[PDB]
Design a binder for this molecule. Structure first.
Ligand SMILES: N[C@@H](CCC(=O)N[C@@H](CS)C(=O)NCC(=O)O)C(=O)O
Ligand SMILES: N[C@@H](CCC(=O)N[C@@H](CS)C(=O)NCC(=O)O)C(=O)O
Ligand SMILES: [Zn+2]
Ligand SMILES: [Zn+2]
Lengths: 218, 218
């Protein structure tokens, strides 16, 4: 029993978890719920031994978790990526909470039918948010320490999503673009990206008005 | 000199931090931004040494953090509240994420002009959420381990806020009410709640449609 990751067959909250596992080279299986599997999830939700049922979930033996960040952190912790003193642990948790905000800012407008309207002040406020991340990353290859951690895969997925939303916003910060290309060049990430099990779309749940549907628009 | 906790003069995301610090008896001072201090925060935000500027923030000498969860976990980690193995650290991060969701479900509708309409389905789904938390707590005095941790203050505040939104929803689970009373009976929490330092209102920012304004309604 390789561990199992359960989620919708979408990028969403689980994509940084899959990227991480692929990068560290850990075996896993996914239990994927497709667009028509709503009732199948409602059926399983309370039968999986989960203390706080939710998606995504992660199960390994008799151990189980929910909460995307707790699953990411469990895998990161096993690879020594969560820090080694109180000050370092807390800095990593601060960066995580920032990256969850960066990805959620998209999600919180993407499901509204007024998305095209909400996008306007969203795009007016985004340069200041991107500037803050650009300054924080500065000339570093990765967000914390000298090698990839779960924070880089959260950050990569948020930037790739935002870039899809408005490419000129992210292209305005050379270090953010270079960071996207850096993560995509990692040998295990490039292999995962080129493989049949990669999910390139949708970014959000299928019913979203941005980053939803079965296929990219056009 | 004592650490500084900076936030709006509202309960919001900082209240579980103030509860935790009063419980463990750590000295702290608050830098409180009032209802008309918005420009004062805009003027401070980039001039406080913060790597990822936001509210709340925490500063102790040249150490600083933002992200309410990271600040809570910093304090909690100094009091050995974040667990002692990867499995136990992960379980605590899971319960944190579910409590962040529990509090955010109120914030996500409270600031919207359509709050009164959104409240209907929110109150339709709330019982199942509270039932999950009621079964998770079960007959335990606290959410994890045998003594209060940052998880309990997060959970207390989210329940008190929800209780204000719909008192009988929470009162339908006696063990959640017993937990609210148990946290309020802790001598250091009672002394805080009876002091001049305590903020009982507003629950969200003053401009919210629910839990806003300068005093509770009617
Ligand atoms: N705080 C959460 C959110 C989890 C979540 O919102 N899950 C949505 C999918 S993005 C869901 O389908 N949950 C299943 C359910 O509520 O039954 C975490 O990061 O995992
Ligand atoms: N993920 C965050 C959210 C922080 C946030 O939304 N803060 C709001 C107040 S509740 C704010 O006024 N931030 C200051 C700003 O936007 O400049 C955390 O938990 O601290
Ligand atoms: Zn490994
Ligand atoms: Zn202390």
């Amino acid at each position: 029993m390789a561990p199992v990751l359960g989620y919708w067959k979408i990028r969403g909250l689980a994509q940084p978890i899959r990227l991480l596992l692929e990068y560290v080279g850990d075996s896993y299986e996914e239990h994927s719920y497709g667009r028509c599997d709503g009732e199948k999830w409602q059926n399983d939700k309370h039968n999986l031994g989960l203390e706080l049922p939710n998606l995504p979930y992660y199960k390994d033996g008799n151990f189980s978790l929910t909460q995307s960040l707790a699953i990411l952190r469990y895998i990161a912790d096993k690879h020594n990526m969560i820090g080694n003193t109180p000050v370092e642990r807390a800095k990593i948790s601060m960066i995580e909470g920032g990256l969850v905000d960066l990805r959620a800012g998209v999600s919180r407008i993407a499901y509204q039918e007024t998305f095209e309207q909400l996008k306007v002040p969203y795009l007016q406020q985004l340069p200041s948010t991107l500037r803050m991340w650009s300054q924080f990353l500065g000339n570093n290859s990765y967000l914390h320490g000298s090698t990839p951690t779960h924070l880089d895969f959260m950050f990569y997925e948020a930037l790739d999503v935002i870039r899809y939303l408005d490419p000129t916003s992210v292209e305005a910060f050379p270090n953010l673009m270079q960071f996207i290309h850096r993560i995509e060049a990692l040998p295990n990430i490039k292999a995962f990206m080129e493989s049949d099990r990669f999910i390139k779309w949708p970014l959000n749940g299928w019913s979203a008005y941005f980053g939803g549907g079965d296929a990219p628009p056009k």
